[PDB]
Assembly symmetry: C3
Homo-oligomer: 146 residues x 3
């Protein structure tokens, strides 16, 4: 965890984000039960009948939040790990990681809370700043070693 001074910060923020995605998956399963909206007939028939094999607007929203996480956290997991080893200023580094962690946690709150536009979209942009900063840094760093 100490092979770079930035790596505990990265691993802390990264695993909190993975746990955070795990929390989104739990919430999705609870909305499915409460609105009785199942994607599979074998699920619906178990919970009351085939008419519960149906889509629901609130389940659809949960699925959109999880998908957006996969579009952003998974690249951060690669980028921040590699960036951790480009020996960033460990302050700047956890600033990157913390900005991303705080922005992504805020993103999920704005999506599932149905918060008015443009809250969700602002949080997405903030989180992408450290990632973009990290990807450019890694690119020059790798490019100049070719």
């Amino acid at each position: 965890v100490m092979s770079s001074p930035a790596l505990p910060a990265f691993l802390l923020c990264s695993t909190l984000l993975v746990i955070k995605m795990y929390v989104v998956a739990i919430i999705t399963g609870q909305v499915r039960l409460r609105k009785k909206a199942f994607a599979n007939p074998e699920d619906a028939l178990r919970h009351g009948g085939p008419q519960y094999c149906r889509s629901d607007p609130d389940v659809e929203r949960c699925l959109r939040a999880h998908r957006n996480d996969m579009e952003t956290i998974y690249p951060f997991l690669f980028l921040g790990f590699v960036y951790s080893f480009l020996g960033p200023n460990p302050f700047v580094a956890w600033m990157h990681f913390l900005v991303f962690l705080v922005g992504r946690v805020a993103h999920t709150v704005a999506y599932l809370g149905k918060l008015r536009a443009p809250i969700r979209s602002v949080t997405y942009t903030l989180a992408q700043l450290p990632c973009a900063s990290m990807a450019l840094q890694i690119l020059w760093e790798a490019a100049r070693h070719l």
Copy 2:
């Protein structure tokens, strides 16, 4: 592959899971051809006409299985790799990795086989146990290094 005693177990289980996802992608393409259900008009027009640009319940099921894999295996790939280096008891470690591998392989069998509830849901929960165990371990380990 030996920078930690847990790492061959992790890499073996991890790559089997990646190959397993690759197998799910192959199956999806075969259902699309057999039911003639294409997502894109350029695909449909190539296979018989625009009326084959259509959704199918069995293709939809394949897409749900692949998506659930992305929600779970990809975090395991990060978590199990990092956990491999927290020097777990290499028995416990491959127990984590094997429980996850066996549970996820069982999950895909239950989804695409249309197995009665709650088989698919039980397999998902078993696989998430080692991941949750791994994420908590990594969190304390990184937190205490900050």
Copy 3:
């Protein structure tokens, strides 16, 4: 970046692919605005009214391209990283990585450009060759260390 001779090639191709996915996300947001097709009512109400909470065929296509990237680049990110450390012939290695990079960049061009079948499907198969080559190599390498 030099802990293996294959690793700069891998990191260069990998981050270009991550940036490439980031570009796909940007394009998706622009199609949503131009066709006025929003997935959330809080978004639609902000851009003209609830009738703009609607699906669009061109937004749907962008989402399919991003999803396919997640199915393929994310495993490459794991596989190519690990393969980088199995000390491949650094020529073969960047050949793997370059074939994947060039194939995946071509895949996105064929999807969003609505190119006639089977262009998109050919590019997907080319990119999967190095990944399959990498996964088999990692599997034997890890299996024989168990």
